[PDB]
Amino acid sequence: HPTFNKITPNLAEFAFSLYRQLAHQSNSTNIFFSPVSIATAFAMLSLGTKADTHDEILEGLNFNLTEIPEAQIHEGFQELLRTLNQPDSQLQLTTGNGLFLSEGLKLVDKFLEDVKKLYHSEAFTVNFGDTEEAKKQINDYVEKGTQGKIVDLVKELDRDTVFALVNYIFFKGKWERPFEVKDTEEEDFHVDQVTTVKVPMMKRLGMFNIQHCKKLSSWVLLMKYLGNATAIFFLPDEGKLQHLENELTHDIITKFLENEDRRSASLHLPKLSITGTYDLKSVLGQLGITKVFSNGADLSGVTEEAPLKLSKAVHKAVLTIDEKGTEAAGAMFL
Amino acid sequence: EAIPRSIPPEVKFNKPFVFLMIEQNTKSPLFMGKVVNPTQK
């Protein structure tokens, strides 16, 4: 009956597709992004595009345009946002879309109602002339949106900006099965074959929806938060990381979420605090989204005042995992 | 009553691993990552 489960496998395959690209750049750097954030943003941008610049975007997010009518896409997206925004009671989960237009700017009326309806976007007017001011205005949106986790989204801001599309997502949950602070103990982490870092290692012996998947050659542990969120951890077997990264699929994830069989194990999961700052312009090109960051870009659906294009695609995500839960936040700036 | 009990397997996440947050209702991937070095931040 629900519409979103019509695009979820698309976002999920988009997530892995984008993941792989990011992993190919450097193999010694922590990765962390928000599939959803990056996708809903380009989703609501295509609304204001046309032709090959429009099609690349939609097809880049993994939508076989022939099989699924663009109309359903935006519709399933409008729904997906709905649900995500009405979180359980023990779990807070917010996301928001914001539009920053220049004062003179006359928009193509349609565009506005479409995003203001299909993406529950907010609408604002700024004087980009005053960079510092306009810059600061936009960072408070993401700062308040993510509750202070992401604060310096935009650093530089082109004097000639016509408009800016912003997105954010905040997540805070608690583990059903918490960790005892007393146990957290410093242990070794074998980063490299020659590099070893000491990391505070959380511990807890007990029932866990853990399990060794021979197909993946990984240990697959699922952890529930109090609410509508589960966390899947993949511990690749010695020398098989790459094999794990290449074998992930949207339907392989579903399997694990369906199963629930518990089992006793002495787990040691380190507590982290990592982040991800990216300029997705190049990585998006590897996935076919290029015409938009080009001089052939058609942003006509946005305004007739002038031919536009995108200069950047900045994404930043922050993650915190401790002995009581997980709070991550992400933000997309277009 | 004291009966024999198994030795729980130990699982240490002390090496590069990948993970992801999923929203149960939609089953959509909220966040995804790969921890290679937790002290890099």
Full set of structural domains in chain A with CATH:
4-175+271-334 (3.30.497.10), 176-270 (2.30.39.10)
CB B34 within 8 A of CB A242: no
Q: Which of B30, B12, B41 is nearest to A30 (CA)?
A: B41
CB A323 within 8 A of CB A305: no
Q: Cα–Cα distance between B33 and A319 in angstroms, integer?
A: 9
**Stretch 10-29 of chain A: residues touching chain B, C-beta under 8 Å:** 11-12, 15, 19, 23, 27-29
Number of structural domains, chain B? 1
Q: Cα–Cα distance between A253 and A232 in angstroms, integer?
A: 9
* SS3 assignment, position A28: coil
Name residue, tokens 């699929």: A249
CB A233 within 8 A of CB A259: no
A318 strand-pairing partners:
A275, A329
What is the full DSSP assignment across A29-52?
Answer: S-EEE-HHHHHHHHHHHHTT--HH
- Give Cα B40 distance to the centre of its chain: 19
- The single-letter code of the amino acid at A278 is Y
Q: Which of A197, A323, A198 is nearest to A267 (CA)?
A: A323
Report the CATH number that the domain containing residue B22 is assigned in CATH: 2.10.310.10
A136 strand-pairing partners:
none
Q: Cα–Cα distance between A96 and A122 in angstroms, integer?
A: 8
For B33, which of A30, A227, A241 is closest by C-beta distance? A30
A84/B13 CB distance under 8 A:
no
CB A303 within 8 A of CB A103: no
Q: Strands A314-321 and A325-333: what pairing?
A: antiparallel
Resolution (A): 3.0
- A124 CB within 8 Å of a chain B CB: no
Q: How many CB pairs under 8 A join A and B?
A: 182
B11/A228 CB distance under 8 A:
no
The tokens for A292 are 């938009």
Residues of chain A contacting B33 with CB distance shorter than 8 Å:
30-33, 274, 276, 319
For A11, which of B11, B24, B28 is closest by C-beta distance? B28
The count of residues in chain A is 334
Q: Under 8 Å CB-to-CB from A290, ≥6 apart: which residues? A: A56, A284
B37/A317 CB distance under 8 A:
no
**Stretch 63-102 of chain A: residues touching chain B, C-beta under 8 Å:** 80, 83-84, 93
CB A268 within 8 A of CB A187: yes
- Expressed as residue numbers, the domain containing B7 is 1-41
What is the full DSSP assignment across B20-41?
Answer: EEEETTTTEEEEEEEES-TT--
B25/A31 CB distance under 8 A:
no
Burial class for A46, CB neighbours closer than 10 Å (0-12, 13-18, 19+): buried
Q: Cα–Cα distance between A330 and A33 in angstroms, integer?
A: 7
Residue B20 has φ and ψ, to the nearest 5°, of -165, 145
- A253 CB within 8 Å of a chain B CB: yes
CB count, 10 Å around CB of A287? 18
Residues of chain B contacting A84 with CB distance shorter than 8 Å:
23, 26, 28
Name residue, tokens 């839960």: A325
Residue A123 has φ and ψ, to the nearest 5°, of -130, 130
The tokens for A136 are 């600061």
| CB burial readout B3-35, b (16+ within 10 A) else e | eeeeeeeebbbbbbbbbbbbbebbbbbbbbbbb
DSSP class of A219: E
